[PDB]
Design a protein around this nucleic acid. Structure first.
Lengths: 415, 52, 53
RNA sequence: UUUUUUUUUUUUUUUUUUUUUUUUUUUUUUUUUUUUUUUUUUUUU
């Protein structure tokens, strides 16, 4: 491949495209440099006054992100949560035996000295502090994520969750579209508060305040969609993580899988820092996103769909991947699992069935080598039977959105 | 067999330099069911050429 | 920028010449090879007239 | 008398944006827009 030459006049041309660094950054390789996660809670002045500052601010206007952060740290400074056994992640120790650790038992550090209105606001607001207001501020991060009319349908479920022995009402009025509370998403410190809340209550699921989770849940495995799609594939095929791995049939899907399965990342750990790698600022480019696993995402989600996933219907179709090559791979996998039913007797009454009892006939089971051999003998082209399988799978899908894998798949297979 | 130019050119020769009816169906399939496409694009060009 | 609008004076009513250039780029043939595909007396005539040295 | 691209130049040319993302997915739940007291033709003598 090294040398390419123009055949008309025997001259050497060198083909080359622009660079593309922008590489991934693993959770582990971060704690190699620093031992703590900096939480810059700027002002540490008057906690009762802050309650009024955020309340009147949110009631239409520009409430300071610095303000709400100062509030949340004061309101959630509950040193609750009796540690069940032991808690350790990436080398950083957090808990032992019967420790009584709170929610901010990772780094706090003070910052700046510029504040807005000055001192005691309006003493209007009673306690009802920890009870619902923190839920809301955290709940706006969930609403802020999206950008389609789903906002006025997810903010609806915000207001109805602040009634758990509370029942108040609402606060702002302006439509979202990224302008009001959406600023907060790009705040290193705010996101750190949300991630520490989700993590604390993922450990302390039984806790009373664990209701704060829904609203802060969308942070666990943010930008880790590829990993989720790999789990989904195992559930939908019913195969093991090892078997599924062997069904990867494209070079650039293999690369991506390898990238995702790097050995020292604590991705299979119960209560780790890994799922909050983005919001805790541990990584500037997730190894686990769809963006950095485009071949795998498309392949996995296409197969998933042929196998009757309802999730996959609406997955994004990535750019700059070998659709043709990827799609025929996914088809073989789906056709194989869809043919070979598991089906074995489970229970009996002393009366068992034992399994041992035309030419272009597909292989017995779900082994890759058997199917690979079968595909060769099929001229490396998908049969009429599997094309008809793919049709049946995609037709009668209804109202599929533009640029989804569902739209790709129906359009490819149902002419 | 593979994706090699010399080989595919030799096969094109064997088809007296004109695209096969299976080739035409391949491009047909690839272009039919393309939605609203604007004027003077290679999208519009390809559907006109291959979808008839 | 004064060209916008002053540009339609360039090759004003020399369209036949322009279609000869265009015919080359579409057929991708040489100028002389396109000339040889002219098959009607009155098209040869016009070509001679258009190419006078 | 004309002229005979409802062509036009200056680069250009995804009604492409990269900041990271990407089920108009969140499940704490829990999922017949089932429910119990008989009953069970919008049956009558």
């Amino acid at each position: 491949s090294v040398t390419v030459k123009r055949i008309i006049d025997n001259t050497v041309i060198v083909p080359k495209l622009p660079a593309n660094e922008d590489p991934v950054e693993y959770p582990a390789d971060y704690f190699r440099k620093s031992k703590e996660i900096p939480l810059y809670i700027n002002t540490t002045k008057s906690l009762s006054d802050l309650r009024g500052y955020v309340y009147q601010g949110l009631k239409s206007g520009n409430v300071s992100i610095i303000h709400v952060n100062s509030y949340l740290y004061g309101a959630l400074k509950d040193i609750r949560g009796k540690l069940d056994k032991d808690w350790s992640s990436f080398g950083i120790n957090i808990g032992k035996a019967g420790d009584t650790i709170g929610i901010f038992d990772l780094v706090s550090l003070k910052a700046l000295d510029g504040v807005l209105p000055d001192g005691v606001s309006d003493a209007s607001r009673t306690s009802a502090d920890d009870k619902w207001l923190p839920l809301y501020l955290l709940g706006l991060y969930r609403v802020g994520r999206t950008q389609m009319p789903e906002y006025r349908k997810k903010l609806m479920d915000g207001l109805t969750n602040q009634c758990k022995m509370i029942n108040e009402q609402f606060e702002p009025l302006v439509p979202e579209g990224r302008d009001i509370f959406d600023v907060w998403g790009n705040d290193s410190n705010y996101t750190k508060i949300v991630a520490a809340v989700d993590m604390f209550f993922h450990m302390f699921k039984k806790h009373e305040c664990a209701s704060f989770r829904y609203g802060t849940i969308v942070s666990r495995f943010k930008d880790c969609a590829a990993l989720a799609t790999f789990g989904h594939l195992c559930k939908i095929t019913g195969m093991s993580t090892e078997d599924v791995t062997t069904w990867i049939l494209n070079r650039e899907v293999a690369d991506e899988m390898v990238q995702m399965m790097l050995p020292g990342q604590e991705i299979d750990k119960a209560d780790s820092y890994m799922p909050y790698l983005i919001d805790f600022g541990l990584s500037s480019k997730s190894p686990y996103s769809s963006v950095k696993n485009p071949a795998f995402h498309f392949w996995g989600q296409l197969t998933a769909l042929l196998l009757r996933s309802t999730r996959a219907r609406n997955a994004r179709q990535p750019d700059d991947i070998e659709y043709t090559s990827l799609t025929t791979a996914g088809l073989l996998y789906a056709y194989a699992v869809g043919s070979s039913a598991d089906l074995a007797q489970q229970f009996c009454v002393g009366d068992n069935k034992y399994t041992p009892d035309t030419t272009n006939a597909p292989p017995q089971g779900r082994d890759v080598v058997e199917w690979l051999g079968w595909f060769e003998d099929q001229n490396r082209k998908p049969t009429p039977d599997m094309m008809q399988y793919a049709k049946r799978a995609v037709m009668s899908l209804q109202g599929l959105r533009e640029k989804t894998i569902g739209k790709y798949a129906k359009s490819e297979f149902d002419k």
